[PDB]
Design an enzyme around this catalytic site. Structure first.
Site, mmCIF file in Angstrom:
data_model
loop_
_atom_site.group_PDB
_atom_site.id
_atom_site.type_symbol
_atom_site.label_atom_id
_atom_site.label_comp_id
_atom_site.label_asym_id
_atom_site.label_seq_id
_atom_site.Cartn_x
_atom_site.Cartn_y
_atom_site.Cartn_z
ATOM 1 N N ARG A 47 0.864 -1.186 0.000
ATOM 2 C CA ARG A 47 0.000 0.000 0.000
ATOM 3 C C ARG A 47 0.901 1.236 0.000
ATOM 4 N NH1 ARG A 47 -2.933 3.125 4.874
ATOM 5 N NH2 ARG A 47 -4.345 4.344 3.596
ATOM 6 N N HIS A 51 0.621 4.219 -2.774
ATOM 7 C CA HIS A 51 0.305 5.622 -2.415
ATOM 8 C C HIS A 51 1.321 6.710 -2.774
ATOM 9 C CE1 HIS A 51 -3.343 5.721 0.484
ATOM 10 N NE2 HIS A 51 -3.449 4.683 -0.317
ATOM 11 N N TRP A 190 -10.447 -8.506 3.073
ATOM 12 C CA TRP A 190 -11.072 -8.945 1.828
ATOM 13 C C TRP A 190 -11.141 -10.446 1.645
ATOM 14 C CZ3 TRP A 190 -7.847 -4.512 2.160
ATOM 15 C CH2 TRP A 190 -8.385 -3.314 1.680
HETATM 16 C C1 HEM Z 1 -9.782 3.117 -6.152
HETATM 17 C C2 HEM Z 1 -8.689 2.472 -5.769
HETATM 18 C C3 HEM Z 1 -8.394 2.202 -4.282
HETATM 19 C C4 HEM Z 1 -9.042 2.581 -3.198
HETATM 20 C C5 HEM Z 1 -10.315 3.455 -3.014
HETATM 21 C C6 HEM Z 1 -8.377 1.947 -2.038
HETATM 22 C C7 HEM Z 1 -8.778 2.146 -0.739
HETATM 23 C C8 HEM Z 1 -8.147 1.437 0.271
HETATM 24 C C9 HEM Z 1 -8.500 1.593 1.651
HETATM 25 C C10 HEM Z 1 -9.663 2.515 2.154
HETATM 26 C C11 HEM Z 1 -7.717 0.778 2.373
HETATM 27 C C12 HEM Z 1 -7.689 0.516 3.915
HETATM 28 C C13 HEM Z 1 -6.811 1.424 4.787
HETATM 29 C C14 HEM Z 1 -6.751 1.074 6.249
HETATM 30 O O1 HEM Z 1 -7.742 1.408 6.989
HETATM 31 O O2 HEM Z 1 -5.712 0.494 6.670
HETATM 32 C C15 HEM Z 1 -6.821 0.097 1.454
HETATM 33 C C16 HEM Z 1 -5.843 -0.783 1.798
HETATM 34 C C17 HEM Z 1 -4.939 -1.418 0.967
HETATM 35 N N1 HEM Z 1 -4.750 -1.092 -0.369
HETATM 36 FE FE1 HEM Z 1 -6.229 -0.174 -1.467
HETATM 37 N N2 HEM Z 1 -7.316 1.218 -2.493
HETATM 38 C C18 HEM Z 1 -7.295 1.311 -3.859
HETATM 39 C C19 HEM Z 1 -6.383 0.736 -4.702
HETATM 40 C C20 HEM Z 1 -5.257 0.023 -4.351
HETATM 41 C C21 HEM Z 1 -4.235 -0.448 -5.239
HETATM 42 C C22 HEM Z 1 -3.968 -0.092 -6.749
HETATM 43 C C23 HEM Z 1 -3.389 -1.154 -4.471
HETATM 44 C C24 HEM Z 1 -2.021 -1.796 -4.912
HETATM 45 C C25 HEM Z 1 -2.075 -2.183 -6.210
HETATM 46 C C26 HEM Z 1 -3.902 -1.201 -3.131
HETATM 47 C C27 HEM Z 1 -3.275 -1.925 -2.136
HETATM 48 C C28 HEM Z 1 -3.796 -1.915 -0.868
HETATM 49 C C29 HEM Z 1 -3.341 -2.826 0.204
HETATM 50 C C30 HEM Z 1 -2.316 -3.899 -0.050
HETATM 51 C C31 HEM Z 1 -4.085 -2.538 1.285
HETATM 52 C C32 HEM Z 1 -4.042 -3.178 2.699
HETATM 53 C C33 HEM Z 1 -3.097 -2.448 3.658
HETATM 54 C C34 HEM Z 1 -3.072 -2.973 5.087
HETATM 55 O O3 HEM Z 1 -3.451 -4.167 5.299
HETATM 56 O O4 HEM Z 1 -2.622 -2.022 5.799
HETATM 57 N N3 HEM Z 1 -5.125 -0.553 -3.054
HETATM 58 N N4 HEM Z 1 -7.080 0.515 0.132
#
Ligand code: HEM
Length: 293
Positions: A47, A51, A190
């Site tokens: 992540r 970002h 998820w």
């Molecule tokens: C519209 C696109 C996206 C949205 C709205 C989104 C939104 C989010 C949100 C709200 C979280 C949770 C944050 C938390 O409370 O810890 C999250 C976690 C995460 N995102 Fe996405 N994300 C998007 C795309 C992506 C993409 C492109 C990737 C990498 C290719 C990604 C990788 C991750 C990973 C690996 C996590 C888990 C992190 C953890 O376990 O701390 N996401 N994302």
């Protein structure tokens, strides 16, 4: 006109130097395995890599991974970056050990290392990002909201130059980690293997019986009875006919998914960078495992 960000190799370092930074991040992943209830820092590194790369604007060439701007307070305190400070703290000791790597190079390799040590596909990576000054830091507001729909996502991704296939391939990164109420106003993972990289995200999206409910932050999420979740943006992938056939393809062929993700993730990470003809080819790091460590 549009900034030009030319990649410049860290003076005098070769492949073996970078293999060593990787091996250090890997050994450290292996060792601090208790983080986030035993998920490990894998998911939060992926992540962090998305970002710092995702502030890129194809229109004036600002933001993107090049400048290591996340290191500055403005970017660092971006409300959409809440929770990332854990990936930072993890990499600091590493930076202190290899002080010649630029930031953007470290933050991006961390993402690659995570994927590959979480059994994902090999991601070719390129060195050369150079730290830029605190004033090249992008204003907050360039990362995507999660409460929206498929047209919102199509539109947003377009600013990063990604097409449909790339957006769905990247999104299956949501197989990793989970949401946390305190960080995003969302809660729950998820899938079940949230620290092994598979096409699990797509199988859940297609196979669970999802219910729309509001969570304690008073935001809507899709809840499965297996205890998984799907944000509106994730959910939107089956609403759109173009996205859904791609979901299907991936639910159906984990290889394909791995190849497509590999390519999209690299691109995501190289967006905005000009690589001279003489620049070394992309490196493919060995895992710990292939090195016998
Ligand atoms: C519209 C696109 C996206 C949205 C709205 C989104 C939104 C989010 C949100 C709200 C979280 C949770 C944050 C938390 O409370 O810890 C999250 C976690 C995460 N995102 Fe996405 N994300 C998007 C795309 C992506 C993409 C492109 C990737 C990498 C290719 C990604 C990788 C991750 C990973 C690996 C996590 C888990 C992190 C953890 O376990 O701390 N996401 N994302």
């Amino acid at each position: 006109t549009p900034l030009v960000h030319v990649a410049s190799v860290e003076k005098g370092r070769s492949y073996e130097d970078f293999q060593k930074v990787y091996n250090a991040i890997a050994l450290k992943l292996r060792e601090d395995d208790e983080y986030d209830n035993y998920i490990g820092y894998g998911p939060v590194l992926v992540r962090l890599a998305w970002h710092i790369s995702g502030t890129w604007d194809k229109h004036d060439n600002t933001g993107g991974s090049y400048g290591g701007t996340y290191r500055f307070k403005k970017e660092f305190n971006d409300p959409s970056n809440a929770g990332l400070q854990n990936g930072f703290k993890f990499l600091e000791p590493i930076h202190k050990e290899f002080p010649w790597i630029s930031s953007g190079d470290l933050f991006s390799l961390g993402g690659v290392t995570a994927v590959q040590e979480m059994q994902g596909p090999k991601i070719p990576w390129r060195c050369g990002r150079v730290d830029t000054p605190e004033d090249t830091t992008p204003d907050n507001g360039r990362l995507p909201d999660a409460d929206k729909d498929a047209g919102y996502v199509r539109t947003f991704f377009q600013r990063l130059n990604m097409n449909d296939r790339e957006v769905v391939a990247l999104m299956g990164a949501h197989a990793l980690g989970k949401t946390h109420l305190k960080n995003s106003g969302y809660e729950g993972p998820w899938g079940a293997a949230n620290n092994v990289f598979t096409n699990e995200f797509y199988l859940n999206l297609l196979n669970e019986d999802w219910k729309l409910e509001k969570n304690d932050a008073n935001n809507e999420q899709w809840d499965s009875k297996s205890g998984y979740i799907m944000l509106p943006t994730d959910y939107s992938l089956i609403q759109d006919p173009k996205y859904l056939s791609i979901v299907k393809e991936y639910a159906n062929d984990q290889d394909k998914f791995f190849k497509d993700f590999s390519k999209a993730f690299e691109k995501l990470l190289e967006n905005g960078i000009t690589f001279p003809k003489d620049a070394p080819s992309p490196f493919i790091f060995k895992t710990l495992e292939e090195q016998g460590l």
